[PDB]
Design a binder for this molecule. Structure first.
Ligand SMILES: CC(C)C[C@H](N)C(=O)NS(=O)(=O)OC[C@H]1O[C@@H](n2cnc3c(N)ncnc32)[C@H](O)[C@@H]1O
Ligand SMILES: CC(C)C[C@H](N)C(=O)O
Length: 1002
């Protein structure tokens, strides 16, 4: 317990040191004069401030944190800036939701939550009243997140942090210049388009202000109009005189030539309302909402309800359907009707829809179902399936044949209906052929749109856009697809999309699945609505009313990082003075152009040339973005617009486009989802309070480095705390007893073994750090490192050589630095080292000899087997080692060598090997042992390479054994071990013992 407290004390002291020394503040004015090794620009997409920062954000930023901790030791000058996102509606949604139940009820509010979560954060009762305005959120949460980050100890130049709404005037001017240049180059466009839309919010709902289906778009439906013919059913008598239409949703208009009736749900509530032209549409509630927002009614979003009813009161109504062969069809019931899709009204195409003919047969069999709703004989019997589309494998009546073949007798046969619908699902999309006149012998793929247009021009069909899946907004409002006018980014331009495809070709994605997602979201993208009305951010500069959504004012902000320290200089809101003395309003479009475009002319500005040149130098030095780390959730939306805007703003300078992007999965805590509902959740401050942020970073580096979800194990973090405490106390012990170690030459066998192991570990760690596999880098550089250390301590009977010990300590403190830099800086100061550890470089690795590491692993295996066999049955041990392989083993290994040499290293199957070795007489007595032997061989062939195929070992087995017999006798608690050369041994040993696998008897 006190170990974590000691760690936190060290962290706070070293953070005070890092702040007072200002070691992480980098400036292009100083670093461009010393061309050290090149720049390294990492970026973390700023998170939203609608709450404290949790462990997922920390895991996502740990990637670039460790990356800069590694690259700064390799000589590259690192830039890790960090912004803070406050654009967007979520803040406002939560706050006004709070006001809703704060003023319609009391304080505390009476029930039968949100205020509960706020008090769970622990604010004072008289302080949540101050949370009505978002101004207090932006004055409160950015400082707290910054404090949490500084307590974590990130290598950030904090003078470059800022806020993203109009509260910050400098970022506001930056966004204004961005959008002015974008609309200047025809990248923005005003127009009336379809989009997901939140009625309660009154604006298009994009991916970052939703609550379900974070990538759902609109989906098109052909909406057929069916004239309700007289005699009107009873419940409609009040609306006599006007036109009454049943609106039915479909995606297969070409099948409407074979309509027989109209399926409705008898126990669902339908609503009939008035359209814009005075007619009456009958649909469901949400269908009416969607239609109203798609300009179907007189007023946008207004549904004048003229009658509410049930499906039972609708059955038997005569209908005039479009394109049907029957001049009169009827309204029939259907019980298997989903209450979410479409209008609650489906078409009856029994020739190519299986559920339709199923229901038709259920009605046609008995008087029970046919009379079950007043459906007289005339509404079921004469309605036969109408052959309209011929699928070659089934005939003119496809669904009929496939259902009669799969032996289905229940419209409610969900398994069999699913089967039958799957069988001809797509074979009617291509292989289907029209049969009606005008289209006799047409590919249905080439006529469905023309038939849709034919119905629309006839005034019998319309377009209905619906959310492909149910979408909830930030305001708990069910989104609908609305046709609204807005300013949108035309991400569908051919030239722009092709240029971004070239950028993706040049972009470095760390896996192929990331590039797959990028190509898919590039092919899927189209006009994207960037205009909002409710929320925060920056207004459109030419249209002061339209606000900019969070996913559009956050595309090229990384250029603002390069000058945030000289424009507002640390102050988040930009209210204070400018360190360069540049007024907030003084930044004009041409000023930004000169700062960010290379060939831009110096504009007419009262700003002196020195400051503009300094900003241009900063930008032209740090850019482009070398790396952007994020979770894979921002792949389809954020990083796509990121590359798009980087291509659009600099269409001539590909050298300034993003260099690389790294995607990680979402974080799991104790193998469980991080959710406030399950009690398995850790904010950054709680995680630091519990796991000594150094150690939290350690466990995060071990959490994972793949696209799959990483796992944060608390027990692993505690184990890391214990290991670090043992390491620190061991280093203290060594500092104490330096005078109690061996001096002189590092010439002992174990000294060489440990030194080569250390150098190999250095190499493995560097190679894992370049590839950003932080889990594997930790495995090679900390765990295996400590293992080699403890092995060398165990085997060094003549005392550990001080030079090797402290070279190891130095190298370990270096390799662990990017993970737990507080403890590493503490140890670096404990060594009496003059400067801070952030100035150190990469440790140079000496020569590596594979053969001595192989002999060390050999001794390890020998010790393991010795402790195994000591279990049963002493004082003396006797070991036997074979020079050459026994004749049968030598022959089998020669055969395996031939089979390896002949075919580029592919040993045949066990079958061929057993067959050919049964074809050798010299193995007749040993065919029982031959196949096991070979088997074992194969294992090691995949375990430690082909070196086991050599007819003789790379080292002296007997001398290697004899260089550590002392440790073996001391650990095995014996009295003597005689090593004999296996030829003096008896028959069994001399016959079965092979080189590399010695035997022994006590
Ligand atoms: C520039 C702008 C358009 C970005 C925008 N401000 C934004 O996305 N803000 S945010 O508050 O949710 O995302 C912050 C980052 O943290 C990662 N992350 C979030 N949650 C988790 C989690 N549970 N587990 C793992 N990672 C998580 C996520 O990928 C994201 O990159
Ligand atoms: C495509 C679906 C919405 C409708 C289907 N073709 C049917 O007749 O039931």
């Amino acid at each position: 317990t006190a170990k974590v407290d000691f760690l936190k004390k060290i962290e706070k002291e070293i953070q005070q040191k890092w702040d007072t020394e200002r070691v992480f503040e980098v400036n292009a004015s100083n670093l461009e004069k010393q061309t050290s090794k090149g720049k390294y620009f990492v970026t973390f997409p700023y998170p939203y401030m609608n709450g404290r920062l949790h462990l997922g954000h920390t895991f996502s930023l740990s990637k670039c944190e460790f990356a800069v901790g590694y690259q700064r030791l390799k000589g590259k000058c690192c830039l890790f800036p960090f912004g803070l996102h406050c654009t967007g509606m979520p803040i406002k949604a939560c706050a006004d939701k709070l006001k809703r139940e704060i003023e319609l009820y009391g304080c505390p509010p009476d029930f039968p939550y949100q205020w509960g979560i706020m008090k769970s954060l622990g604010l004072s009762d008289e302080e949540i009243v101050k949370f009505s305005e978002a101004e207090h959120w932006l004055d409160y949460f950015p400082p707290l997140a910054i404090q949490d980050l500084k307590r974590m100890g990130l290598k950030v130049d904090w003078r470059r942090s800022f806020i993203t709404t109009d509260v910050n005037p400098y970022y506001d001017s930056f966004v204004r210049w961005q959008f002015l240049t974008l609309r200047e180059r025809n990248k923005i466009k005003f127009g009336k388009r379809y989009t997901i839309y939140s009625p309660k919010d009154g604006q298009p709902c994009m991916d970052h202000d939703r609550q379900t289906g974070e990538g759902v778009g609109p989906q098109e439906y052909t909406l057929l109009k069916l004239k309700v013919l007289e005699p009107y059913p009873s419940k409609l008598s009040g609306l006599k005189g006007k036109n009454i239409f049943l609106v039915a949703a479909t995606l297969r208009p070409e099948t409407m030539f074979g309509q027989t009736n109209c399926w409705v749900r008898p126990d669902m509530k339908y609503i009939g309302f008035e359209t814009v032209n005075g007619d009456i549409f009958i649909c469901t509630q949400k269908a009416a909402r969607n239609m109203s927002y798609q300009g179907f009614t007189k007023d946008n979003g207004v549904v004048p309800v003229v009658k509410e009813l049930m499906g039972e009161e609708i059955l038997g109504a005569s209908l005039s359907a479009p394109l049907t062969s029957y001049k009169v069809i009827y309204v029939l019931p259907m019980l298997t009707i989903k209450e979410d899709k479409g209008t609650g009204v489906v078409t009856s195409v029994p020739s190519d829809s299986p559920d339709d003919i199923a229901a038709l047969r259920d009605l046609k069999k008995k008087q029970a179902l046919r009379a079950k709703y007043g459906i007289r004989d005339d509404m079921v019997l004469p309605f036969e399936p109408v052959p309209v589309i011929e699928i070659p494998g089934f005939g003119n009546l496809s669904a009929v044949t496939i259902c009669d073949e799969l032996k289905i007798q229940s419209q409610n046969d969900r398994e069999k209906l699913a089967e039958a619908k799957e069988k001809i699902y797509l074979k009617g999309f291509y292989e289907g052929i029209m049969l009606v006149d005008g289209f006799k012998g047409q590919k249905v793929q080439d006529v469905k749109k023309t038939i849709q247009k034919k119905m629309i021009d006839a005034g019998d069909a319309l377009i209905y856009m619906e959310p492909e899946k149910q979408v909830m907004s930030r305001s708990s409002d069910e989104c609908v697809v609305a046709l609204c006018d807005q300013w949108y980014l035309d991400y569908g331009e051919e030239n722009w999309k092709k240029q971004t495809s070239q950028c993706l070709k040049n972009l470095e994605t760390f896996c192929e699945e990331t590039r797959r997602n990028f190509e898919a979201t590039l092919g899927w993208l189209q006009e994207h609505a960037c205009s909002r009305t409710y929320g925060l951010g920056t207004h459109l500069p030419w249209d002061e009313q339209w606000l900019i959504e969070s996913l559009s004012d956050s595309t090229i902000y990384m250029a603002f990082y390069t000058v945030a320290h000289l424009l507002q200089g640390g102050n988040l809101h930009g209210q204070a003075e400018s360190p360069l003395g540049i007024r907030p309003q003084q930044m004009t479009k041409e000023v930004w152009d000169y700062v960010f475009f290379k060939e831009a002319p110096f504009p007419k500005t009262q700003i002196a040339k020195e400051k503009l040149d300094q900003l241009k130098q900063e930008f032209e030095f740090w850019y482009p973005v070398d790396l952007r780390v994020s979770g894979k959730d921002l792949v389809p939306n954020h990083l796509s617009y990121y590359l798009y805007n980087h291509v659009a703003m600099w269409p001539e300078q590909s050298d300034k486009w993003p260099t690389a992007v790294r995607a990680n999965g979402h974080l799991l805590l104790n193998s469980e989802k991080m959710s406030k509902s399950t009690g398995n959740f850790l904010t950054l401050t709680q995680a630091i309070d519990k796991f000594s942020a150094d150690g939290m970073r350690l466990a995060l580096a071990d959490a994972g480095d793949t696209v799959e979800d990483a796992n944060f194990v608390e027990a692993m973090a505690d184990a890391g705390i214990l290991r670090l405490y043992t390491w620190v106390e061991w280093v203290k012990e060594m500092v104490a007893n330096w005078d109690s170690l061996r001096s002189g030459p590092a010439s002992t066998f174990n000294d060489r073994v440990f030194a080569s192991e250390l150098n190999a570990g250095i190499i493995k760690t560097d190679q894992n750090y370049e590839k950003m596999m932080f889990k594997e880098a930790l495995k090679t550089g900390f765990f295996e490192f400590q293992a080699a250390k403890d092995k060398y301590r165990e085997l060094a009977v003549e005392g550990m050589h001080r030079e090797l010990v402290f070279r190891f300590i130095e190298v370990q403190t270096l390799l662990l630095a990017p993970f737990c830099p507080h403890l590493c800086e503490h140890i670096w100061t404990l060594l009496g080292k003059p400067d801070s550890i952030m100035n150190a470089s990469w440790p140079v690795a000496g020569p590596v000899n594979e053969v001595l590491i192989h002999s060390s692993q050999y001794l390890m295996e020998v010790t393991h087997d010795l402790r195994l066999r000591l279990k049963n049955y002493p004082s003396h041990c006797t070991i036997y080692v074979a020079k050459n392989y026994p004749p049968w083993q030598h022959t089998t290994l020669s055969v395996l060598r031939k089979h390896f040499e002949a075919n580029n290293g592919k040993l045949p199957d066990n079958k061929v090997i057993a067959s050919e070795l049964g074809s050798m007489p010299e193995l007749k007595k040993y065919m029982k042992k031959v196949m096991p032997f070979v088997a074992m061989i194969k294992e090691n062939l995949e375990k430690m390479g082909p070196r086991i195929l050599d007819l003789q070992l790379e080292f002296d087995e007997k001398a290697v054994l004899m260089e550590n017999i002392v440790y073996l006798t001391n650990s095995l608690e014996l009295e003597h071990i005689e090593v004999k050369f296996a030829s003096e041994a008896e028959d069994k040993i001399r016959e079965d013992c092979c080189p590399g696998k010695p035997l022994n008897v006590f």
